[PDB]
């Protein structure tokens, strides 16, 4: 090895000894170090054995022949040089290891191999080098090498093909070749499929076998139970032993990528030397630029497996954490669950498990970032002098800044959240009582409150804009900041230190590399600290006490046996059932009897192993069907609620439904039994749910029934019918053991056994007649009583943000990326000045200009981040104002036609992506667009010839960008829609834990939850593979431009001054990272800009008549006497109201009677103009209603609706939201409403904080509060809508409102009889018009 023939000549030939030693030791050596390690994977991972195919044999036979040929050399050598013995034998032995390896790989089922491909590639390259040398030298030993090379080439070609393999849509990962598994080509079929036709959930491939929940949840369960047995228990230790072997391969892929990333600056330093050093062989530059393409492209292929491993491991964590929490939630004791809120347990997957997946992306960087920093600091310390310390200074000041900034954000980040949270419940209230809200004209009153809370959160967002501005400045200007400090302290520390390209552009490339680790380490630290509390919560939940599975003896088919059993609701709390004993025989009806808080429901809970048994013996025999007091309704259809995951039997189902008297309920419900009952679907009355729960229990066909007050909410006739056909000895369950908790005597004599208790103690149980004869405790008890988003949407967002702010940001950021190219061009000029006297003559002026330009870069980066977030706040406030005004200035018809969920989602999620997502995405997309365009301008300007690569790369970028957008706009949309159902189902199962554990349907629910999370993963996994595909394809576009920006800089080195080449290559090096973010953010932006369109949709719908006309406004005393006249009124809805010509005189009490389907209520809607008059001229006194603005009439007429809607806040804000009426008037009205005694009782006086809908207040109180509102209004026209306190409200409406004209729509004739001039509506027509005396 000497430089004359290898380096310094025009024919770069390797020496003969080098050829025969190192070029042969490289490949053989590769297989020898990998072979042992490869058994680990081959053994731990197995997939069967591949059959005998021609390909596998072809490879094995060539491996045999190759070994022979290599040993044939040893034979000829045996037939002087020491290398002519060891090298052929070593090659033969490693070849024998190669053929054995394909053999064992066949045995272990590996269709495509990575080691058996890279090894042949390395051998091929080594053979190619020797081949070229041997063909340039020119029989004896050469022909053996030609045979070796041809066989190696054919072996390499064979190794590319994938062997035969050992539901449809199987994940192509299982059937993909290794060469296509690094380029992620197996998803390309989806990509094109994403552009031609939209993707549904039916086309996503089935989750691969390992990631499925049944494979990753049981392993975590086993590892956690093992740790608990070890007993103190830590989840981090269990998470390690579970997800550590897979995450361990991330270290190898990360470490190689880190080392290969810093090869860029080193090869750049060599290339700057080659350009600067003349008379050097040309081929040297071609070799140097070839190493810039192989190293930075292999870096892409090795980095986009670290990311894949980290993402797959995080997704596995999210799948296993969700399943483990779900499986633990079904065995947790009640006392333990009291310590955790229901919604907080759902947070264990909604945010807690998501935090682990988010962490897993960058968790492996807490060591890579310090390693990148240390290695870079070592490299640049050699590049320049000890000035690194100065740059280190800028680094040791920048990192703490980020740190505190991150912390600060987090705190008020949470603040923002809670503010939004508050608003959202308020928003719900407006969507709840919208009808009563528009009846009294409270729209303006509540719009002000929503605007106030909006301003409250907008101040926090405004501050966080400042914190994001410094975060972006530290992301962009930190590499420059370090560069400026280092260059300044280097060039001015003395006079013998100069700045040439090899000392400037290499350091610049290192600083560009160093930017990411410094600016992402604080985020990683914040994420780890945030996950430190998520881990604590997860461990706390998973370490709760488990339910005793043997406490109740569940013997399969004296039916229920309890002796000396005392139960508790908690370990330390006193017993609730003391010393209970009773024996319920098979097929007997037993009624639990007691007062409130006696311990009746506790008995049924204890028979289900819900109570904590401190002592005793319980031997419930056979299956148990539980009808809980609080009915648990699944959001599935009513049919599946009754079925409860059981085979449908038409005769049995149709015998159960009417026996519960569910036929009228089926009739009223829209779809019948297929209607979607539950909280999300149609709401059901308490009695209806009681029947449904009972119907489900009856269908379940258990032998033991525990009916914890099934007839509480059903009426007396319905209850008696139910008992007759279901629980009665002559019902459907004649031969079923029934144990019922009741407080109604009506069915007691029919009960076989009555268990009467007092204070959780058995008290003289027995049969009804015997207990009555005994005259004891029972006698006492009885005596007790889709396409591409339009640019018009972008223009709409620009109009909302403001043209001034929109154009100022673009101009000021173009200024940022113009002062950046010129500053780097100033460095190009600086590194090309004469070096006369060993001192840069113009060091002062050039350093000052560079620093001033960079400071100009420090005012424009902070200027475009302060003009995109401020604009974001300004646009969000305008969008919220417009949406609120549109919604509040619209009639009630679309409120029925448009579901409330849509509007609440628009007010919740849509406003979140406009203020907290769009400003960040637009700062990065626009930040990366000119980063690319500006980088391509320097490359093109330095070497014009680099323009014929622009056409071929433009097509690749266009076709990759279009496919990725068209396919990933839908995949994360399919993932978002499938994420909420998992949390919803977990909430549902948490609500009904006791029912699930009683019916013993735990396995079905556990499998449903894992199927739903599997459906979520089915959309999440293609989403993370799409990013890898996009990056890999566009990295090699930014990688081949590195080759071409340096190739044209090598062929034209003569017409270059070693001042542009380093600049061009340095800028091309950062093209790769900024190009995959231009496209990722071009896809997020499209799915984020659709929020503006969905937030502006209601700006184009029919609105109500103007609230204030102000041209034909009525006088202050508009209802002078209150003379109402319906002149040929007709209300469209075909006409519910028709031919209505009636006259209600001023101060004359008038009521409206009619059956269901008449226009009684619709008549009130006529008075308040809720629905526009199809044909009618209602006039109050001498003024037409249709001409008057809505608010005016709605203020001058009052209504007391069916169910009074009390809004959250104080009672005074309920009575007078505008606070227009004085405190004395409020007090007088409240006293006149029979409420003075109660309203004076609250500690908060008039400021009593009533919850959503006035849950704390009683129904009677809420009704009297609505009456107080009407009384405080002091208007001459009042309408009443009648459905205990009836005597009070009727007397109050008859007390002082005799002066005012009162219309009354009552479903009860008793009250209407008092009112004169009763109007009767048959089908909208006036059937009778006269006083009740003329009625009879
Ligand atoms: N040197 C790194 C290179 C990392 C790399 O090349 N890939 C980056 C791309 S820049 S990822 C960096 C990015 N930061 C920003 O771009 C924000 C900058 C500033 N806040 C502003 O507003 O301007 C960020 O926060 N990202 C987090 C996210 O994805 O949400 C990555 O993390 N890829 C993630 C992926 O592909 O999924 C390494 O060691 O590998």
PDB file of C-alpha atoms in Angstrom, residues 457-674:
ATOM      1  CA  UNK A 457     -58.720  31.755  26.771  1.00  0.00           C
ATOM      2  CA  UNK A 458     -57.533  34.136  24.039  1.00  0.00           C
ATOM      3  CA  UNK A 459     -55.304  36.009  26.498  1.00  0.00           C
ATOM      4  CA  UNK A 460     -53.567  32.724  27.352  1.00  0.00           C
ATOM      5  CA  UNK A 461     -53.210  31.939  23.647  1.00  0.00           C
ATOM      6  CA  UNK A 462     -51.827  35.450  23.094  1.00  0.00           C
ATOM      7  CA  UNK A 463     -49.145  34.894  25.717  1.00  0.00           C
ATOM      8  CA  UNK A 464     -48.301  31.459  24.297  1.00  0.00           C
ATOM      9  CA  UNK A 465     -47.777  33.163  20.937  1.00  0.00           C
ATOM     10  CA  UNK A 466     -44.818  34.943  22.551  1.00  0.00           C
ATOM     11  CA  UNK A 467     -43.404  31.633  23.833  1.00  0.00           C
ATOM     12  CA  UNK A 468     -43.801  29.998  20.408  1.00  0.00           C
ATOM     13  CA  UNK A 469     -42.021  32.962  18.805  1.00  0.00           C
ATOM     14  CA  UNK A 470     -38.846  32.379  20.840  1.00  0.00           C
ATOM     15  CA  UNK A 471     -39.168  28.625  20.248  1.00  0.00           C
ATOM     16  CA  UNK A 472     -39.140  29.149  16.482  1.00  0.00           C
ATOM     17  CA  UNK A 473     -36.292  31.668  16.764  1.00  0.00           C
ATOM     18  CA  UNK A 474     -34.283  29.086  18.706  1.00  0.00           C
ATOM     19  CA  UNK A 475     -35.122  26.477  16.061  1.00  0.00           C
ATOM     20  CA  UNK A 476     -34.003  28.642  13.132  1.00  0.00           C
ATOM     21  CA  UNK A 477     -31.286  31.028  14.324  1.00  0.00           C
ATOM     22  CA  UNK A 478     -29.454  28.805  16.839  1.00  0.00           C
ATOM     23  CA  UNK A 479     -27.107  27.214  14.246  1.00  0.00           C
ATOM     24  CA  UNK A 480     -26.297  30.698  12.937  1.00  0.00           C
ATOM     25  CA  UNK A 481     -25.930  32.031  16.487  1.00  0.00           C
ATOM     26  CA  UNK A 482     -23.327  29.371  17.263  1.00  0.00           C
ATOM     27  CA  UNK A 483     -21.676  29.975  13.885  1.00  0.00           C
ATOM     28  CA  UNK A 484     -21.456  33.734  14.434  1.00  0.00           C
ATOM     29  CA  UNK A 485     -20.048  33.397  17.946  1.00  0.00           C
ATOM     30  CA  UNK A 486     -17.494  30.784  16.876  1.00  0.00           C
ATOM     31  CA  UNK A 487     -16.363  32.601  13.722  1.00  0.00           C
ATOM     32  CA  UNK A 488     -16.115  35.954  15.503  1.00  0.00           C
ATOM     33  CA  UNK A 489     -14.080  34.629  18.439  1.00  0.00           C
ATOM     34  CA  UNK A 490     -11.942  32.578  16.033  1.00  0.00           C
ATOM     35  CA  UNK A 491     -11.045  35.254  13.487  1.00  0.00           C
ATOM     36  CA  UNK A 492     -10.399  38.034  16.025  1.00  0.00           C
ATOM     37  CA  UNK A 493      -8.595  36.066  18.757  1.00  0.00           C
ATOM     38  CA  UNK A 494      -5.331  36.544  16.840  1.00  0.00           C
ATOM     39  CA  UNK A 495      -3.995  37.398  13.381  1.00  0.00           C
ATOM     40  CA  UNK A 496      -2.640  33.985  12.315  1.00  0.00           C
ATOM     41  CA  UNK A 497      -6.145  32.456  12.379  1.00  0.00           C
ATOM     42  CA  UNK A 498      -7.951  32.758   9.008  1.00  0.00           C
ATOM     43  CA  UNK A 499     -11.361  31.494   7.759  1.00  0.00           C
ATOM     44  CA  UNK A 500     -11.225  29.354   4.564  1.00  0.00           C
ATOM     45  CA  UNK A 501     -14.058  27.088   3.286  1.00  0.00           C
ATOM     46  CA  UNK A 502     -12.641  23.872   4.868  1.00  0.00           C
ATOM     47  CA  UNK A 503     -12.796  25.829   8.147  1.00  0.00           C
ATOM     48  CA  UNK A 504     -16.121  27.601   7.491  1.00  0.00           C
ATOM     49  CA  UNK A 505     -18.542  25.525   5.404  1.00  0.00           C
ATOM     50  CA  UNK A 506     -17.682  22.258   7.161  1.00  0.00           C
ATOM     51  CA  UNK A 507     -18.363  23.995  10.471  1.00  0.00           C
ATOM     52  CA  UNK A 508     -21.572  25.420   8.990  1.00  0.00           C
ATOM     53  CA  UNK A 509     -22.685  21.919   7.992  1.00  0.00           C
ATOM     54  CA  UNK A 510     -21.882  20.693  11.504  1.00  0.00           C
ATOM     55  CA  UNK A 511     -23.929  23.540  13.015  1.00  0.00           C
ATOM     56  CA  UNK A 512     -26.867  22.691  10.747  1.00  0.00           C
ATOM     57  CA  UNK A 513     -26.618  19.112  12.035  1.00  0.00           C
ATOM     58  CA  UNK A 514     -26.280  20.320  15.644  1.00  0.00           C
ATOM     59  CA  UNK A 515     -29.454  22.425  15.398  1.00  0.00           C
ATOM     60  CA  UNK A 516     -31.839  19.474  15.845  1.00  0.00           C
ATOM     61  CA  UNK A 517     -30.318  17.721  18.923  1.00  0.00           C
ATOM     62  CA  UNK A 518     -30.085  20.981  20.881  1.00  0.00           C
ATOM     63  CA  UNK A 519     -33.629  22.102  20.050  1.00  0.00           C
ATOM     64  CA  UNK A 520     -35.272  18.694  20.539  1.00  0.00           C
ATOM     65  CA  UNK A 521     -33.590  17.599  23.788  1.00  0.00           C
ATOM     66  CA  UNK A 522     -35.658  20.004  25.976  1.00  0.00           C
ATOM     67  CA  UNK A 523     -38.836  18.691  24.346  1.00  0.00           C
ATOM     68  CA  UNK A 524     -37.735  15.110  25.049  1.00  0.00           C
ATOM     69  CA  UNK A 525     -36.971  16.002  28.675  1.00  0.00           C
ATOM     70  CA  UNK A 526     -40.393  17.633  29.019  1.00  0.00           C
ATOM     71  CA  UNK A 527     -42.044  14.554  27.502  1.00  0.00           C
ATOM     72  CA  UNK A 528     -40.192  12.231  29.890  1.00  0.00           C
ATOM     73  CA  UNK A 529     -41.170  14.374  32.887  1.00  0.00           C
ATOM     74  CA  UNK A 530     -44.791  14.403  31.688  1.00  0.00           C
ATOM     75  CA  UNK A 531     -44.756  10.614  31.243  1.00  0.00           C
ATOM     76  CA  UNK A 532     -43.321  10.275  34.760  1.00  0.00           C
ATOM     77  CA  UNK A 533     -46.769  11.107  36.166  1.00  0.00           C
ATOM     78  CA  UNK A 534     -48.605   9.014  33.561  1.00  0.00           C
ATOM     79  CA  UNK A 535     -46.546   6.019  34.686  1.00  0.00           C
ATOM     80  CA  UNK A 536     -47.426   6.792  38.309  1.00  0.00           C
ATOM     81  CA  UNK A 537     -51.146   6.914  37.499  1.00  0.00           C
ATOM     82  CA  UNK A 538     -50.938   3.713  35.443  1.00  0.00           C
ATOM     83  CA  UNK A 539     -49.144   1.866  38.247  1.00  0.00           C
ATOM     84  CA  UNK A 540     -51.607   3.180  40.840  1.00  0.00           C
ATOM     85  CA  UNK A 541     -54.555   1.936  38.788  1.00  0.00           C
ATOM     86  CA  UNK A 542     -52.967  -1.427  37.969  1.00  0.00           C
ATOM     87  CA  UNK A 543     -51.991  -2.012  41.620  1.00  0.00           C
ATOM     88  CA  UNK A 544     -55.523  -1.762  43.038  1.00  0.00           C
ATOM     89  CA  UNK A 545     -57.049  -4.612  45.018  1.00  0.00           C
ATOM     90  CA  UNK A 546     -58.727  -7.329  42.966  1.00  0.00           C
ATOM     91  CA  UNK A 547     -62.248  -8.751  43.431  1.00  0.00           C
ATOM     92  CA  UNK A 548     -62.354 -12.017  45.460  1.00  0.00           C
ATOM     93  CA  UNK A 549     -63.440 -14.550  42.758  1.00  0.00           C
ATOM     94  CA  UNK A 550     -64.273 -17.251  45.376  1.00  0.00           C
ATOM     95  CA  UNK A 551     -66.055 -15.079  47.961  1.00  0.00           C
ATOM     96  CA  UNK A 552     -69.434 -16.220  46.599  1.00  0.00           C
ATOM     97  CA  UNK A 553     -69.750 -19.937  45.866  1.00  0.00           C
ATOM     98  CA  UNK A 554     -71.199 -20.161  42.344  1.00  0.00           C
ATOM     99  CA  UNK A 555     -72.165 -23.823  42.174  1.00  0.00           C
ATOM    100  CA  UNK A 556     -73.673 -25.073  38.856  1.00  0.00           C
ATOM    101  CA  UNK A 557     -77.028 -26.835  38.791  1.00  0.00           C
ATOM    102  CA  UNK A 558     -81.105 -24.208  48.636  1.00  0.00           C
ATOM    103  CA  UNK A 559     -80.915 -22.109  45.474  1.00  0.00           C
ATOM    104  CA  UNK A 560     -79.471 -19.191  47.460  1.00  0.00           C
ATOM    105  CA  UNK A 561     -77.749 -19.938  50.758  1.00  0.00           C
ATOM    106  CA  UNK A 562     -76.405 -17.376  53.226  1.00  0.00           C
ATOM    107  CA  UNK A 563     -75.257 -18.256  56.745  1.00  0.00           C
ATOM    108  CA  UNK A 564     -73.765 -15.787  59.237  1.00  0.00           C
ATOM    109  CA  UNK A 565     -72.551 -13.537  56.432  1.00  0.00           C
ATOM    110  CA  UNK A 566     -71.440  -9.966  57.052  1.00  0.00           C
ATOM    111  CA  UNK A 567     -70.475  -7.776  54.086  1.00  0.00           C
ATOM    112  CA  UNK A 568     -68.809  -4.385  53.697  1.00  0.00           C
ATOM    113  CA  UNK A 569     -68.539  -1.747  51.007  1.00  0.00           C
ATOM    114  CA  UNK A 570     -64.879  -1.234  51.980  1.00  0.00           C
ATOM    115  CA  UNK A 571     -62.105  -2.907  53.957  1.00  0.00           C
ATOM    116  CA  UNK A 572     -62.113  -0.347  56.780  1.00  0.00           C
ATOM    117  CA  UNK A 573     -65.739   0.817  56.662  1.00  0.00           C
ATOM    118  CA  UNK A 574     -68.233  -0.849  59.025  1.00  0.00           C
ATOM    119  CA  UNK A 575     -70.414  -3.718  57.793  1.00  0.00           C
ATOM    120  CA  UNK A 576     -73.568  -2.791  55.901  1.00  0.00           C
ATOM    121  CA  UNK A 577     -75.201  -6.232  56.275  1.00  0.00           C
ATOM    122  CA  UNK A 578     -74.598  -7.673  59.751  1.00  0.00           C
ATOM    123  CA  UNK A 579     -75.060 -11.394  60.358  1.00  0.00           C
ATOM    124  CA  UNK A 580     -77.440 -12.145  57.495  1.00  0.00           C
ATOM    125  CA  UNK A 581     -78.760 -15.688  57.119  1.00  0.00           C
ATOM    126  CA  UNK A 582     -81.440 -16.984  54.753  1.00  0.00           C
ATOM    127  CA  UNK A 583     -82.119 -19.914  52.434  1.00  0.00           C
ATOM    128  CA  UNK A 584     -84.081 -19.240  49.238  1.00  0.00           C
ATOM    129  CA  UNK A 585     -85.270 -22.512  47.633  1.00  0.00           C
ATOM    130  CA  UNK A 586     -85.347 -23.099  43.903  1.00  0.00           C
ATOM    131  CA  UNK A 587     -88.143 -21.399  41.986  1.00  0.00           C
ATOM    132  CA  UNK A 588     -89.325 -19.218  44.877  1.00  0.00           C
ATOM    133  CA  UNK A 589     -90.286 -15.538  44.944  1.00  0.00           C
ATOM    134  CA  UNK A 590     -88.537 -13.639  47.744  1.00  0.00           C
ATOM    135  CA  UNK A 591     -89.147  -9.950  48.432  1.00  0.00           C
ATOM    136  CA  UNK A 592     -86.640  -7.852  50.353  1.00  0.00           C
ATOM    137  CA  UNK A 593     -88.487  -5.415  52.603  1.00  0.00           C
ATOM    138  CA  UNK A 594     -87.177  -2.425  54.518  1.00  0.00           C
ATOM    139  CA  UNK A 595     -86.960   1.326  54.814  1.00  0.00           C
ATOM    140  CA  UNK A 596     -84.605   3.648  52.944  1.00  0.00           C
ATOM    141  CA  UNK A 597     -80.979   2.850  53.669  1.00  0.00           C
ATOM    142  CA  UNK A 598     -81.939  -0.470  55.236  1.00  0.00           C
ATOM    143  CA  UNK A 599     -79.646  -2.707  53.190  1.00  0.00           C
ATOM    144  CA  UNK A 600     -81.934  -4.153  50.534  1.00  0.00           C
ATOM    145  CA  UNK A 601     -79.820  -3.297  47.484  1.00  0.00           C
ATOM    146  CA  UNK A 602     -76.719  -4.268  49.459  1.00  0.00           C
ATOM    147  CA  UNK A 603     -78.072  -7.823  49.711  1.00  0.00           C
ATOM    148  CA  UNK A 604     -78.364  -8.157  45.941  1.00  0.00           C
ATOM    149  CA  UNK A 605     -74.926  -6.578  45.523  1.00  0.00           C
ATOM    150  CA  UNK A 606     -73.536  -9.111  48.016  1.00  0.00           C
ATOM    151  CA  UNK A 607     -75.060 -12.037  46.131  1.00  0.00           C
ATOM    152  CA  UNK A 608     -73.173 -10.800  43.038  1.00  0.00           C
ATOM    153  CA  UNK A 609     -69.797 -10.546  44.836  1.00  0.00           C
ATOM    154  CA  UNK A 610     -69.918  -6.746  44.685  1.00  0.00           C
ATOM    155  CA  UNK A 611     -69.857  -6.213  48.453  1.00  0.00           C
ATOM    156  CA  UNK A 612     -66.667  -6.950  50.376  1.00  0.00           C
ATOM    157  CA  UNK A 613     -67.402 -10.087  52.411  1.00  0.00           C
ATOM    158  CA  UNK A 614     -65.801  -9.784  55.828  1.00  0.00           C
ATOM    159  CA  UNK A 615     -67.365 -13.050  56.998  1.00  0.00           C
ATOM    160  CA  UNK A 616     -69.856 -15.754  56.124  1.00  0.00           C
ATOM    161  CA  UNK A 617     -70.788 -18.254  53.416  1.00  0.00           C
ATOM    162  CA  UNK A 618     -72.811 -17.559  50.252  1.00  0.00           C
ATOM    163  CA  UNK A 619     -73.728 -20.359  47.842  1.00  0.00           C
ATOM    164  CA  UNK A 620     -75.769 -18.882  44.984  1.00  0.00           C
ATOM    165  CA  UNK A 621     -76.561 -21.778  42.644  1.00  0.00           C
ATOM    166  CA  UNK A 622     -76.720 -21.282  38.883  1.00  0.00           C
ATOM    167  CA  UNK A 623     -76.636 -18.335  36.527  1.00  0.00           C
ATOM    168  CA  UNK A 624     -77.654 -14.935  37.889  1.00  0.00           C
ATOM    169  CA  UNK A 625     -79.569 -12.237  36.011  1.00  0.00           C
ATOM    170  CA  UNK A 626     -79.265  -8.818  37.647  1.00  0.00           C
ATOM    171  CA  UNK A 627     -81.759  -6.002  37.167  1.00  0.00           C
ATOM    172  CA  UNK A 628     -79.954  -3.041  38.761  1.00  0.00           C
ATOM    173  CA  UNK A 629     -81.700  -0.074  40.314  1.00  0.00           C
ATOM    174  CA  UNK A 630     -79.870   2.350  38.005  1.00  0.00           C
ATOM    175  CA  UNK A 631     -80.596   0.941  34.557  1.00  0.00           C
ATOM    176  CA  UNK A 632     -77.536   0.386  32.372  1.00  0.00           C
ATOM    177  CA  UNK A 633     -78.343   0.826  28.678  1.00  0.00           C
ATOM    178  CA  UNK A 634     -75.844   0.044  25.945  1.00  0.00           C
ATOM    179  CA  UNK A 635     -75.709   2.473  23.036  1.00  0.00           C
ATOM    180  CA  UNK A 636     -76.506  -0.452  20.699  1.00  0.00           C
ATOM    181  CA  UNK A 637     -80.041  -0.917  19.383  1.00  0.00           C
ATOM    182  CA  UNK A 638     -82.850  -1.896  21.742  1.00  0.00           C
ATOM    183  CA  UNK A 639     -82.972  -5.370  20.189  1.00  0.00           C
ATOM    184  CA  UNK A 640     -79.309  -5.944  21.040  1.00  0.00           C
ATOM    185  CA  UNK A 641     -79.896  -4.414  24.475  1.00  0.00           C
ATOM    186  CA  UNK A 642     -82.517  -7.079  25.191  1.00  0.00           C
ATOM    187  CA  UNK A 643     -80.534  -9.826  23.443  1.00  0.00           C
ATOM    188  CA  UNK A 644     -77.283  -8.935  25.245  1.00  0.00           C
ATOM    189  CA  UNK A 645     -75.034 -10.808  22.831  1.00  0.00           C
ATOM    190  CA  UNK A 646     -77.301 -13.854  22.657  1.00  0.00           C
ATOM    191  CA  UNK A 647     -78.855 -15.808  19.802  1.00  0.00           C
ATOM    192  CA  UNK A 648     -82.119 -14.219  18.721  1.00  0.00           C
ATOM    193  CA  UNK A 649     -85.201 -16.406  19.256  1.00  0.00           C
ATOM    194  CA  UNK A 650     -88.161 -14.697  17.609  1.00  0.00           C
ATOM    195  CA  UNK A 651     -90.782 -16.476  19.725  1.00  0.00           C
ATOM    196  CA  UNK A 652     -88.928 -15.928  23.014  1.00  0.00           C
ATOM    197  CA  UNK A 653     -88.036 -12.322  22.177  1.00  0.00           C
ATOM    198  CA  UNK A 654     -91.629 -11.594  21.168  1.00  0.00           C
ATOM    199  CA  UNK A 655     -92.820 -13.221  24.381  1.00  0.00           C
ATOM    200  CA  UNK A 656     -90.435 -11.091  26.451  1.00  0.00           C
ATOM    201  CA  UNK A 657     -91.069  -7.696  24.853  1.00  0.00           C
ATOM    202  CA  UNK A 658     -94.794  -7.394  25.571  1.00  0.00           C
ATOM    203  CA  UNK A 659     -94.596  -9.180  28.932  1.00  0.00           C
ATOM    204  CA  UNK A 660     -92.535  -6.173  30.008  1.00  0.00           C
ATOM    205  CA  UNK A 661     -95.171  -3.953  28.334  1.00  0.00           C
ATOM    206  CA  UNK A 662     -92.469  -2.680  25.976  1.00  0.00           C
ATOM    207  CA  UNK A 663     -94.860  -2.669  22.995  1.00  0.00           C
ATOM    208  CA  UNK A 664     -96.033   0.966  23.455  1.00  0.00           C
ATOM    209  CA  UNK A 665     -92.402   2.012  23.923  1.00  0.00           C
ATOM    210  CA  UNK A 666     -91.475   0.191  20.717  1.00  0.00           C
ATOM    211  CA  UNK A 667     -94.345   1.940  18.934  1.00  0.00           C
ATOM    212  CA  UNK A 668     -93.421   5.476  20.006  1.00  0.00           C
ATOM    213  CA  UNK A 669     -89.733   4.961  19.222  1.00  0.00           C
ATOM    214  CA  UNK A 670     -88.937   5.761  15.561  1.00  0.00           C
ATOM    215  CA  UNK A 671     -87.310   2.554  14.313  1.00  0.00           C
ATOM    216  CA  UNK A 672     -89.074   0.251  16.781  1.00  0.00           C
ATOM    217  CA  UNK A 673     -86.703  -2.118  18.542  1.00  0.00           C
ATOM    218  CA  UNK A 674     -83.921  -1.215  16.085  1.00  0.00           C
TER     219      UNK A 674
END
